[PDB]
Design a protein around this ligand. Structure first.
Ligand SMILES: CC(C)(O)C1CCN(Cc2ccc3nc(-c4c(F)ccc5[nH]ccc45)nc(N4CCOCC4)c3n2)CC1
Length: 834
């Protein structure tokens, strides 16, 4: 082992937040085998990348320019302000002009110069029409001039990458736990399940005994299923009831061998279904967890009416249960089912997984996948085949085959969900894990978020940290020296702030009070940090194109309400930046932020859905990245206050909410009457957007301290970590021009945007349902695969015409008109004072 290679792994360990070489919690070599197995797809991906295009990371799209962006263009003309030094020359450009074509027309008014966005590491390069660049469309939407600054293309050198018919049986020896309470007198038994895709194939149980520090049986549990019949990805799921503890063991190993021998397995406890329950990983807490000793000792045309029945089944929502009758119909006419890509999940749920002959015919059916291979890619459908309900390698691989076709743009929309879907994988090395490795290594933006996404899990999931660490390691070994330096700097900043937060909060404390002593203790520690020492600059984890510089220590403070996070402000590292404005980041500690990260991601999905449906509901996507254990970073949105603070501006610590105050605030903050009309329209659209989005996700009923607004009328939600559908209070309606059933032209405008936006999401029901199911399974702890998931269906009005749905949503608007300020008042009494 090279002393420099040893140093390189020590670097990687700190970048990951876990040692992949650490063997304290294994019973096989699956992790090491995956570490080995991933060398090839990494090497194949580093070898195939354009060093130049990788260095500049052009962020683009194939999707058409939306209607709301074409109308903003005046006469097939786009203005680009190209900067040199003091000088800046404006240029009229056609939307279809490629970056080379634009450079030459400027060179007219030696040829190794590139166009770069002012204030960021964003390059308008490669052969793409200017309209198809994501920064360009972003500017068009929200109104800023397109400022470029002609410079030298980055040096790719900096990106250099370091050089048998027997029945199956198990003997439950006993269960051991170091300590327990005294007591009380309780019963205890072991349940052994043979699972595959959450489907219980076979089940046996031990004789119940009293719950003491040690319990033993030494009883064999003979199962009906034969050894030859065990499918790959099948699990032995061992559970203890009084459900208190669980643990899993893959029956078929990674080398396709049956599991055999003595097994002491440290179990996970339940804190009273979810992705944590499927884990092959063992509880690393050997001195405090419940254990289990086990023993294993044993190589792999339709008639008219039925066609109607088949098609009716196929038509149902993914949360619709299949009867034996549906399963027998789907299976018998499997070659007719195959002619419906949308029938694949329901068909694959009708497979006799615990019967080799069927699994083989499934593989026979799958070999001729003409329909599936030719089918127009469906993320929703593709993802249904990647959840908990599918344990088969081949079924999961066909979903990954369709994802191969997804462009960087879309991979960036569903990246988190795709990283979460690795929790539903039977084995560490999988088609999906390799897909994420390939994409990450291929593009710099995808690679950055993959790093953070994987790091959020490694830091706070004992159940999948081991698996995720091997994927991060594999990625880190191929991103390049430059990215490894960026990642070191970001990690340095995070670890140093963590310490500052772990010291500042070690002298207070939560509840009433912000203290001048604490703000003083804060600024002191940052003054000590900046010299010396911390990184000079760093890429903002939620906005990698941005580079943060020195701290504005005086602008930094400690925030107001109840779990004490840092309001940091940084100078920008790019001196070619347009504005002198700071980079504001909230460094929060004490809370897991993965759920907030998830909510915001699904919102970003909804904007892209609305984009495809030609709509723009002006949602405000602000950065929010979970950066380690119970720690993270939130983007500070400029000129924005909470709704509640607008109520305490006129009024105070009540309670007594006034109708006129929001419209009052907006005119006070709008410089011109022209700007106030723009702010009133931006409000109407953004209010509508959050009314539908929050309603669909079932999180509409929030306090106004959790709803924020920009001085430009942009409404947005924060802090996601009597009842109403959403928040459409009298203060919002007053901005629209109404007061207690007094319909206005802007409230009429509003209702229509709402209904257009609602029907637009309804056209993507199955996608939203699958995204919502995956979120509850991988995001939050234990949730019901039946009522909890079922809300989304009801909210989306599944099985209704557009007119009934149009009505449904208008009724919801009226429940908000009926309750007015009531719900907000009740929130104010519960949250503010018990
Ligand atoms: C400086 C001073 C006077 O305290 C201000 C008084 C008013 N507050 C409002 C406030 C009060 C509380 C706030 N809390 C959060 C926040 C949070 F604290 C925890 C999780 C989160 N998820 C999403 C946002 C978020 N995020 C805020 N943002 C600031 C604006 O940009 C988006 C993120 C946030 N803002 C801002 C600071």
């Amino acid at each position: 082992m090279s002393e420099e290679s040893q140093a390189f792994q020590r670097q990687l360990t700190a970048l990951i937040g876990y040692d992949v070489t650490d063997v304290s919690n294994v019973h096989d070599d699956e992790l090491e085998f995956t570490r080995r197995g991933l060398v090839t797809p990494r090497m194949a991906e580093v070898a195939s990348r354009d060093p130049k295009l990788y260095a500049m990371h052009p962020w683009v799209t194939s999707k058409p320019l939306p209607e709301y962006l074409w109308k903003k263009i005046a006469n097939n003309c786009i203005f680009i302000v190209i900067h040199r030094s003091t000088t800046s020359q404006t240029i009229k450009v056609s939307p279809d002009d490629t970056p080379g074509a634009i450079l030459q027309s400027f060179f007219t008014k030696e040829q190794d110069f590139v166009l770069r966005v002012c204030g960021r590491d964003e390059y308008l390069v490669g052969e793409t029409p200017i309209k198809n660049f994501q920064w360009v469309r972003h500017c068009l939407k929200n109104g800023e001039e397109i400022h470029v600054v002609l410079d030298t293309p980055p040096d790719p050198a900096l990106d250099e990458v370091r050089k048998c018919d027997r029945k199956f049986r198990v003997k439950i020896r006993g269960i051991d736990i170091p300590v327990l309470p005294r007591n009380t007198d309780l019963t205890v038994f072991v349940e052994a399940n043979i699972q595959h895709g959450q489907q219980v194939l076979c089940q046996r149980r031990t004789s119940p005994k009293p719950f003491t520090e040690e319990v033993l049986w030494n009883v064999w549990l003979e199962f009906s299923i034969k050894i030859k019949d065990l499918p790959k990805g099948a699990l032995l799921n061992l559970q203890i009831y009084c459900l208190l503890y669980y643990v899993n063991l893959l029956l078929i190993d990674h080398r396709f061998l049956l599991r055999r021998g003595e097994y002491v397995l440290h179990m996970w406890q339940i804190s009273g279904f979810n992705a944590d329950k499927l884990t092959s990983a063992t509880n690393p807490d050997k001195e405090n967890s419940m254990s289990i000793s086990i023993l294993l000792d044993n190589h792999p045309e339709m008639p008219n009416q039925l066609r109607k029945q088949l098609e009716a089944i196929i038509a149902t929502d993914p949360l619709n249960p299949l009867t034996a009758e549906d399963k027998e119909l789907l299976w018998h006419f499997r070659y007719e089912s195959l002619k419906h890509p949308k029938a694949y999940p329901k068909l694959f749920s009708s497979v006799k997984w615990g019967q080799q002959e069927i699994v083989a015919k499934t593989y026979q059916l799958l070999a001729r996948r003409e329909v599936w291979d030719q089918s127009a890619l469906d993320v929703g459908l593709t993802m249904q085949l990647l959840d908990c309900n599918f344990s088969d390698e081949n079924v999961r691989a066909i979903a990954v085959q369709k994802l191969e076709s997804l462009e960087d743009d879309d991979v960036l929309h569903y990246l988190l969900q795709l990283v979460q879907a690795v929790k539903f994988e039977p084995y560490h090395d999988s088609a999906l894990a390799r897909f994420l490795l390939k994409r990450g290594l291929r593009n710099k933006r995808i690679g950055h978020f993959l790093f953070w996404f994987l790091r959020s899990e490694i830091a706070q999931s004992r159940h999948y940290q081991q698996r995720f660490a091997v994927i991060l390691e594999a990625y880190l070994r191929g991103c390049g020296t430059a990215m490894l330096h960026d990642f070191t700097q970001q990690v340095q900043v995070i670890e140093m702030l963590q310490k500052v937060t772990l010291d500042i909060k070690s002298l207070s404390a939560e509840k009433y009070d912000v203290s001048s002593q604490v703000i003083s203790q804060l600024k002191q520690k940052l003054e000590n940090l900046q010299n010396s020492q911390l990184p000079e600059s760093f890429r903002v984890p939620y906005d990698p194109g941005l580079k943060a510089g020195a701290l504005a220590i005086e602008k930094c403070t400690v925030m107001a309400s109840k779990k004490k996070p840092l309001w940091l402000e940084f100078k920008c590292a790019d001196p070619t930046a347009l504005s002198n404005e700071t980079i504001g980041i909230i460094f929060k500690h004490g809370d897991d932020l993965r759920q907030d990260m998830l909510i915001l991601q699904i919102l970003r999905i909804m904007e892209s859905i609305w984009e495809t449906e030609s709509l723009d509901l002006c949602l405000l996507p602000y950065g929010c990245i979970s950066t380690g254990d119970k720690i993270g970073m939130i983007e500070i949105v400029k000129d924005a206050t909470t709704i509640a603070k607008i109520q305490q501006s006129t009024v105070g610590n009540t309670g007594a909410f006034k109708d006129e105050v929001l419209n009052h605030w907006l005119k006070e903050k709008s410089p011109t009457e022209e700007k106030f009309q723009a702010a009133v329209e931006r409000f109407v659209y953004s209010c509508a957007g959050y009314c539908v989005a929050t309603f669909v996700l079932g999180i509409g009923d929030r306090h106004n301290d959790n709803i924020m607004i920009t001085e430009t009328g942009n409404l947005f939600h924060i802090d996601f970590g009597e009842r109403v559908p959403f928040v459409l209070t009298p203060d919002f309606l007053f901005v629209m021009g109404t007061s207690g059933k007094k319909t206005s032209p802007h409230f009429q405008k509003f209702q229509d945007i709402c209904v257009k936006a609602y029907l637009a999401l309804r056209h993507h029901t199955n996608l939203l349902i699958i995204l919502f199911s995956m979120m509850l399974m991988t995001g939050m702890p234990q949730l019901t695969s039946k009522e909890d998931i079922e809300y989304i269906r009801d909210a989306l009005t599944v099985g209704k015409n557009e007119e009934d749905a149009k009505k449904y949503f208008l009724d919801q608007i009226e429940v908000c008109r009926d309750k007015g300020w009531t719900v907000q008042f009740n929130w104010f009494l519960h949250l503010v004072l018990g």
